[PDB]
Symmetry: none
């Protein structure tokens, strides 16, 4: 019993943008207040956590395009 | 018993945009207030959590396009 | 008993947009208030949670287009 | 007596195609026979000729599109 | 008497194609036979000729697109 | 009497192709036979000729695109 597998996908795909100008952008939020009160913090087994955060973000990429691919050939016996 | 598998998908797909100008954008929210009160925090087994957060975000990508692909050939016995 | 599988899908698909200008956009919400009170927090077995959040978001992508594909050939015995 | 010619043709044309796949094509003609008998051949000036030819042609272009133009301003006296 | 010619043709044309795959092509003609018999051949000036030819041609271009132009301003006296 | 010629053609043309794959191509003609019999051949001036030829050609360009132009300003007297 002979097994033959050929795995030859092809992609010529493009992910693209064009823009004339980004222009004037004004991030001006009023001052927030964040208060958190807790007594104990027990953490185990791959847990991840964020407490009391206050983030201001002004992300203005001229492109900002993204492509994701995954290929996976798996074999048993 | 011979098994032959051929895996040859083709894509020439495009994900694209054109824009004249982004123009004036004004992120100006009033100051929020966030209060959280808790006594104990027990965390285990891949849990992830966010408490008391106050996020202001002004994301203005000139493209912002996205493509996702997954290929998966699996075989047994 | 011979098994032959051929997997050759083709796509030339496009996902595209055109825009003259994005123009003036004004995110100006009044200041919210969020209060949460809790005594205990027990978390296990892949749980994920968000408490007391107050998010202001002004997402203005010049394209914002998205494509998703999945291919899956599976075989047994 | 003045003369003024402004030859300014503007071209924005496109000649285009899409095809998914060209597929299986089978050029299998039976064997031809060509016999020509002649005694004398006298040629002069701009003659061009072909005798006793047997051509098999397969032509499978992925596009095969064509454009031709012939601009011609002529002036006298 | 003045003369003024402004030969300014503007070209923005495109000749283009997409193809997914060219696929299996099978040029398999049967064996031809070509016999030509002649006694004398006298040629002069601009003659060109072909005799007794047997051509097998496979031509499979991935594009195969063409553009031709012939601009020609001519002036006299 | 003044004369003024402004020969300024502007070209922004494109000739282009995409192809996913060229695929399996099988040039397999049967064996031809070519017989030519002649007594005398006298040629003069600009003659060009071919006799008794048997050509097998496979041509598989990945693009195969062409562009030709022939600008020609001519002036007299």
């Amino acid at each position: 019993g002979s097994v033959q597998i050929v795995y030859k996908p092809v992609d010529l795909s493009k992910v693209t943008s064009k823009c004339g100008s980004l222009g004037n952008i004004h991030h001006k939020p009023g001052g927030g207040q964040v208060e958190v009160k807790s007594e104990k913090l027990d953490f185990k087994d791959r847990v991840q956590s964020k407490i009391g955060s206050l983030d201001n973000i002004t992300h203005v990429p001229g492109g900002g395009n993204k492509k994701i691919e995954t290929h996976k050939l798996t074999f048993r016996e």
